A paper describes a structure:
No crystal could be obtained with the complex of Fab p4-163 and PstS1. Thus, we switched to p4-170, which is a closely related variant of p4-163 and a member of the same B cell clone (Clone 1), and has 97.6% and 93.86% amino acid sequence identity to p4-163 heavy and light chains, respectively. In addition, p4-170 exhibited similar inhibitory activity in MGIA to p4-163. The Fab p4-170 and PstS1 complex could be crystallized, and the structure was determined at a resolution of 2.4 Å with one PstS1–Fab p4-170 heterodimer in the asymmetric unit. As revealed by the structure of the complexes, p4-170 binds to a different epitope from the one recognized by p4-36. The epitope recognized by p4-170 is highly discontinuous and conformationally proximate to the Pi binding site in the middle of the molecule, between the two domains I and II of PstS1. The epitope is a large surface of 977 Å2 and comprises three helices and four loops of PstS1. The interactions between p4-170 and PstS1 are mediated through salt bridges, hydrogen bonds, and Van der Waals contacts. Except for CDRH1, all the CDRs of p4-170 are involved in the interactions with residues 85, 88, and 92 of the PstS1 domain I and residues 125, 174, 177–178, 181–182, 190, 246–248, 267–268, 270–271, 275–276, and 279–281 of domain II. Four salt bridges are formed at the contact interface, including Glu88PstS1[OE1]–Arg55H[NE], GLu88PstS1[OE1]–Arg55H[NH1], Lys268PstS1[NZ]–Asp97L[OD1], and Asp279PstS1[OD2]–Arg54L[NH2].
In the present study, we explore B cell responses during ATB, while focusing on the immune-dominant antigen PstS1. We isolate and analyze a total of 85 monoclonal antibodies (mAbs) from one patient with elevated anti-PstS1 responses and find two antibodies, p4-36 and p4-163, from distinct clones that demonstrate inhibitory activity against both BCG and Mtb. Structural analysis reveals that the two antibodies are directed against two different epitopes on PstS1 and do not compete with one another. In the present study, we characterize two different sites on PstS1 that can be targeted by antibodies capable of inhibiting Mtb growth.
Residue numbers in the entry:
A (entry chain H): 1 to 140, 145 to 197, 202 to 225
B (entry chain L): 5 to 175, 177 to 216
C (entry chain A): 18 to 351
Amino acid sequence: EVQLVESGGGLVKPGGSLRLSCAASGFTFSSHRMHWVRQAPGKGLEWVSSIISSRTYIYYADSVKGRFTISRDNSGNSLFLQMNSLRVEDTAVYYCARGDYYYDGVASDPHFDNWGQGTLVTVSSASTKGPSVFPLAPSSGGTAALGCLVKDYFPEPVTVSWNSGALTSGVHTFPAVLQSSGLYSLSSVVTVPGTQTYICNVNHKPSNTKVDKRVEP
Amino acid sequence: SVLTQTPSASGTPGQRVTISCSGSRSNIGSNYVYWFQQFPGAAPQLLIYRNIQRPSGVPARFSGSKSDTSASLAISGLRSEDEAHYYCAAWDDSLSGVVFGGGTKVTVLGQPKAAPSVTLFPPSSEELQANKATLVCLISDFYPGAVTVAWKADSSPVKAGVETTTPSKQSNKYAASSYLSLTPEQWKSHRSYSCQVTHEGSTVEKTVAPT
Amino acid sequence: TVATTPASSPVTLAETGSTLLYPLFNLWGPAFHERYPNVTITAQGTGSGAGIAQAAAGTVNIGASDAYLSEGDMAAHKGLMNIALAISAQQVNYNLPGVSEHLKLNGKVLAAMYQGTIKTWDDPQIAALNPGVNLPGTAVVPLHRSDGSGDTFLFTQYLSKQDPEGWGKSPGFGTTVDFPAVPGALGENGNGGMVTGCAETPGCVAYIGISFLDQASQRGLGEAQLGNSSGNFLLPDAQSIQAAAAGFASKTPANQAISMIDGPAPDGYPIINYEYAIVNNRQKDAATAQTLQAFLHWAITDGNKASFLDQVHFQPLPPAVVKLSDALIATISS
């Protein structure tokens, strides 16, 4: 199956730079124009750029032209987006997308038959903060609710799994709150029917915070 | 958003919903149109390419058409699973770039009213050892997606240190959460704290005790 | 700047390649020679494969190809360019004497016919496009070009764009394609071999260039209306060819290497192409360079008059594409 995996997202200050990567597999990578598409949180899709090779036509949206470089490494199934003089309004989830087959080096229709999961780029003056992770235990035969509080982090995102992925049923990780302080907080809760062990695997890559916390009554 | 779609479209189950996408001579008027479907939290997926063509795996009740500077997506036999955003897209000769429509949010009517489920958590002792305290009120599985939260110390309301999310569409009811920030002194200087969740005039109250 | 007159020194320009462009080249040559007797023009019909190869190797001055050079071609051969001379097209011919209608066919049906899954001409997938037409049970006999061919390039680019998950994945497009070996399938040499091979046995289907359409119809072959991805079905002609080309007049790149197959124009014929002179920007001497500039400029001007192009059912370059060609011709030096 075709797979595209973006990476390199995180936090940058206004005026800084960041380079994004996209690892491709499941098809002849050089036989497709590759695109980047971005999406501000809660907003619509905005196309960014497309490329076949350094020797053919390369396209940029007016919003990014002169500040962005799209490129690729066909030998390693890699697409790149290097961004310079970033602005607050460049904050978005950046998607790597496969485009039309390589018929010529001039056409660039939005024939986007495969997309990655996207990587979030936040452009902000505020500093990185790692969250504190707190267990949410039940204090008192039926089902109980078990959780983890991911408290005071910035920026997004945060991933939470349970028992390193083995406990998937009944897992509800909630959209984060944005407090007045400008920090985020989020909770993941699991519903369970003293002998078993429950651990929430919390990851906050911008602060390199990776925490495994058990939840015990 | 250079192409123009209605921001919101709705249909009853079983009907055909049509989403228009209006462009200009430079983009739709001269180029193939492409349609995408996006669910909350997921990447867009290709629905229709080259005006009318349907990828394998996309069901035949999804259809496309084009007329001059306008294109249309038709969703026949509307289903609850079709609740999503739909974007049109095309190359633009003047810009030499791709243009998108703003997306049409598609709601499938008929969702029954659902009172919210509420779970309240006391502050963890671990957070208490850090001289902090936070109450976590988790609100889920309610519809329609409008809710107001109120906090109470014993019987009288707390207003300071309240942080509450916008309701958000789950994979298809709504979820919200509220967080009450206390000092560890305030937390046990009271007998109880309550999270009241009012939904369409009806209030669901959970309560937690330091005792 | 373009050279308007050829060198007064005697100069021979040698051409080889595209059999689609060959008949028109045999009108361009003598007329330009009748106006400039010191200029000799020779032409061969050997297919776009040979036209590209021999131009790259430097055996001829003009390689005629219906296919633009790939970027690998331009990388491997310094100074080699494709210069658009005119607009041609390609029809699908078939041998069905009992049917008078112009049968409608599209890429998905033609791909299945060439893949061997549509076996008879009354297959429901064909009848679906031609309701009420007296389709016979005659077997489908798919013909393709044996030699490296720009017509094969156009046709398989049509099959790929109309069937991207099938033919587009395999066997794709190119001047040389791994056509499936389904029963009846045969490779024919040149456009003339397709005309005669299609007329040889009832049920044959063949992709034939429009400079051979007169000969094909005089052999009693049918001529199909081809479908574009907008859903319409078109015969190849002035209107539908101009409508498709107009869809790619604007977005034509400076180096003119562009596919115009299955264009966005709803009334556009889906198999049209630029006719290319594959030439190098360095000739052997200054006189050849000037005479080659003069001949090429003459062909996109006086050679694009209808009195020439109507004889092979070609269409002229729009004025924007004319200036683009002049730019590449102006770089032809020594």
